[PDB]
Amino acid sequence: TKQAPGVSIITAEDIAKRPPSNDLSQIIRTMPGVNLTGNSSSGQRGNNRQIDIRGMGPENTLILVDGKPVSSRNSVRYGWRGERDSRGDTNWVPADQVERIEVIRGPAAARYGNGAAGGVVNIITKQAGAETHGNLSVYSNFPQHKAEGASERMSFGLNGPLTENLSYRVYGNIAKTDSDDWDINAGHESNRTGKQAGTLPAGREGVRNKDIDGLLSWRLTPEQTLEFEAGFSRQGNIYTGDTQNTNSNNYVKQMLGHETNRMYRETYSVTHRGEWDFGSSLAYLQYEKTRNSRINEGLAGGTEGIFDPNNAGFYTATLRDLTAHGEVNLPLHLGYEQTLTLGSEWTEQKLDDPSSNTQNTEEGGSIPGLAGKNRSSSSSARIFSLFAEDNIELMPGTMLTPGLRWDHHDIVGDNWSPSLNLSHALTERVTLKAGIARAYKAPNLYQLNPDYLLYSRGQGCYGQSTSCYLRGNDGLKAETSVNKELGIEYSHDGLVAGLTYFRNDYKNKIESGLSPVDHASGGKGDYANAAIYQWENVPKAVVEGLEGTLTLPLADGLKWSNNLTYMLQSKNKETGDVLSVTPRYTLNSMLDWQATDDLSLQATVTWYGKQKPKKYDYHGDRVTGSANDQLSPYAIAGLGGTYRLSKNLSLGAGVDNLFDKRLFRAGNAQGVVGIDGAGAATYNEPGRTFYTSLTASF
Ligand SMILES: O=C(N[C@H]1COC(=O)[C@@H](NC(=O)c2cccc(O)c2O)COC(=O)[C@@H](NC(=O)c2cccc(O)c2O)COC1=O)c1cccc(O)c1O
Ligand SMILES: [Fe+3]
C-alpha cells in the first residue's frame, strides 16, 4: 500500500499522473495529515505556503533528500510573526528525477530528532542500475487567465557503471514559474485608505531554477559501499509586489518583474554503506552552504519586510550547515525476536546575516547589553545526538519499537525524546497501530540571538500602544511535543480502508512575547523608553485531528483512491487563538482508468473545508470587520492522461481546476491603519490551467 497509519509513499508513477508545475509541495500536500500553510496566523507572506504535517507548522516539517537534511530556509530572516520570506525547501530536487517521496507523521518521526515534531518528508532520487539508463523530461502549462504565471520545466537524468565496482548518477534541471501579474488581486484587495490607498496584496512570486547533481557510488568490496556527491542549485525570484504588511513604496514598484532574491544551495556529501553478517551500517558527512542574496528590508513596524530605500542594494546571508550521522542495525535472536539500531548524530549551523541585526535604538531608547550599531552578524548551534531503536517481534504480525533519543544543544542544554510504536495484526487483513513519542524542536538562530532586534512604535506591541522592541533570547527552552496516534487499517487485494486519530500536546512553542521583561532608556518623544519583549516559550498548545484513506478497485483497469485530513483542534492554550490556519478538512480523490495497454486516464477532485482567521490582533485585542472574513468550502477538479508511444517515449496532457474556481489574496489577516484585514483570504488559488508533458528514456 501507499498509505499505512502515520506513513505515506508517493511513487515516481504518481508524480507522472499528477505532474507538479515546479515545486513538489503540490503533490506532497495531497497525503493524509499534510496541509500547505504559513507558520503562524498573520497571513504575512501568505502566497509563500509550505508543507505542514498535522498543523504543527512547516518549521516542524524536516525535509530530507536521500536521508540528508535540507536547512536552506534557515538562511532567511525569521520575522516577528514566525514567517520567513521563503518558498520553503521542497523545490531543490526536480520532480522528474524523484524515485519516491516518504512522509512520516507524528510519533514514528520523533526518532529523527530536531524539527520532526510534525514529521519527516524524505525526497528520494533515482539511482544508477546494473546497466546505463537515462531520461529527458519536459513539462509546460498554460493558464486560462493571463494574470496567473505559466510554468516550464526541462530535466535530464543519466546513470550507469564505469567499472564492475564503480557506479554514477547525474541529473540537471532548468525551470521557470512566471510570477502572477502585479495587478492580479486588483478589485479583490481589502479596503485601503489614506497613505495606503492604491496598495496591493501580491500574487504568487515566480522562480527560476538551475539544479545539477553528480554522484559516484564505489563498492570497493562485497560488503563495503562508498558514495561521493555534490549538488549545485540556484533559485532567483520574479518579484510581483509582495511585502510583509502589503504596504508599498517606490523601490517596491521599481523591482516589479526583477530578481530581488537569489538562493544558491551547494551540497557535498560522503556516504559509506555497510552490509555484513552481524548486520548493516551507514554513516554520512553532508556540507550544505546556502547564500541568500536579497535586497535590504527594514526591521521596524510597517517597515519590517519592505525594501529599505535608504540602504538600497543586495546583502548576502550565508548558512554553512554541517551534518555527520552514524547508524548500525543488529538482528538479535533472544526470548523475543528483534532488530537493534545504534546511532550518533553531529550538526553545526553557522549563520552569517549582515542585515537582520542592524535595527538601532535611537528612537525607542538604548538596551543595556545590546550595542545600537555594528552588532555581530554571527550565530551558530551544535547539537550532539545519541539514539537506539529496538524493533521487537513479540508474535508474528506484532512489532513493538521502543527508541531513546538524547540530544545536547550547546546553548539550550539537554533534550530527552523517548518513543514507543506498536503495530498489531488483529486479522491477516486488519492491523491496529498505536504510538506515543516526545518530539524535539531547537530554537532557530534568530529566536536565540540577543543581537536580533525588531521595533514597533506600538501597532505591533502586545497589550499596549507604546513603542516596543522584540529581542532574541539565548535563555529559551527547546519546544517539545508528546505526539500520540491511535489508528486502524483494513488491507486485502488492493482494497484499503483506514482511519487514524492523532493528538500532539505541544510544550514551550517559541513565539513573540506578551509581557515586557524590561524597558529601554532614552530615544525620541512619545516613543522614548520603549518596552522590551523577548521570544518566549508558550507553556501549552494542542493539535488534534483525523487521517483517513480508502482505496476501492471498481474493476480491473480502474482504481478509486481517497485521502482525508480532518483538523479537530489547533490551539495556543495561553491566548486561545489558532497556531496555523488550515482548512477544517481536505479530501483528495483520484479515479485511475488504465483505458488500454498504452493509455492511462486520471480524474481528481480536492475538497477544502472552511478556513477561519485568528481572533486576536498583535495587541491581543479582538479583530473586527473584514478581519473576521472566512473562506467557504470549495473543490478543485482535474482530468489528465499519459499516452505511451513506445518503451522510449510517453506524452502527458490534462487540465488542473476544470471549473475555474479562483481565490485572491486580499492582504494579511488583521486590520492595520489604512489597510483593512483580509481574514482567511491570504493566498491566490489559480484558475483553469492546461498542461502537457513528454518523457523520453532508455
Ligand atoms: O502594518 C503596519 N503598518 C502599516 C500601517 O501603519 C501606517 O501606515 C501608519 N502607522 C501608524 O499610524 C502607527 C500608529 C501607532 C503605532 C505604530 O507602530 C504605527 O505604525 C504610518 O506608518 C507608516 O506609514 C509606515 N510605518 C513606518 O514607517 C514605521 C517606522 C518605524 C516604526 C514603525 O512602527 C513604523 O510603523 C508603514 O506602516 C504601514 O504601512 C504595522 C505592522 C506591524 C507593526 C507596526 O508597528 C506597523 O506599523
Ligand atoms: Fe508601526
Numbering used by the authors: 24 to 721
Text taken from the publication that reported this structure:
Soaking of native crystals with Fe3+-enterobactin prior to data collection resulted in colour changes in the crystals. The data collected from such crystals revealed additional difference electron density that could unambiguously be modelled as a single Fe3+-enterobactin molecule. The ferric-siderophore is bound to PfeA by residues from loops L2, L3, L4, L7 and L11 on the extracellular surface, and is partly exposed to solvent. The side chain of Arg480 sits between rings I and II and makes electrostatic/cation-π interactions with ring II. The oxygen atoms O6 and O3 of catecholate III hydrogen bond to Ser479 and Gln482; O5 and O2 of the catecholate II hydrogen bond to the main chain nitrogen atoms of Arg480 and Gly325, whilst O4 of catecholate I hydrogen bonds to backbone nitrogen atom of Gln482. Comparison of the Fe3+-enterobactin complex structure with the apo-structure shows that L4 has undergone a large change (6.3 Å shift between Cα of G325) of conformation in order to interact with enterobactin molecule. The change in conformation of Glu327 of L4 results in the side-chain reaching further inside the pore to make a salt bridge with Arg100. In the Fe3+-enterobactin complex, the peptide bond at Pro28 (β-turn type II) flips resulting in the formation of an anti-parallel β-sheet rather than the α-helix and in disorder of the TonB box. We do see a correlation of movements between the binding site of the Fe3+-enterobactin molecule in the extracellular loops, the top of plug domain and the N-terminus. This suggests a route by which siderophore binding could be coupled to TonB engagement.
In Gram-negative bacteria, Fe3+-siderophore complexes are recognised at the bacterial cell surface by highly selective outer-membrane TonB-dependent transporters (TBDTs). These transporters bind the Fe3+-siderophore complex and translocate it into the periplasm. The structures of pyoverdine, pyochelin, citrate and ferrichrome iron complexes bound to their respective transporters FpvA, FptA, FecA and FhuA showed that the ferric-siderophore complexes were bound inside the barrel adjacent to the plug domain, a position thought to be poised for translocation. Pseudomonas aeruginosa, a serious opportunistic pathogen, does not make enterobactin but does possess a TBTD outer-membrane protein PfeA, related to FepA, that binds and translocates Fe3+-enterobactin into the periplasm. PfeA has the same two domains (22-stranded β-barrel and N-terminal plug) common to the TBDTs.
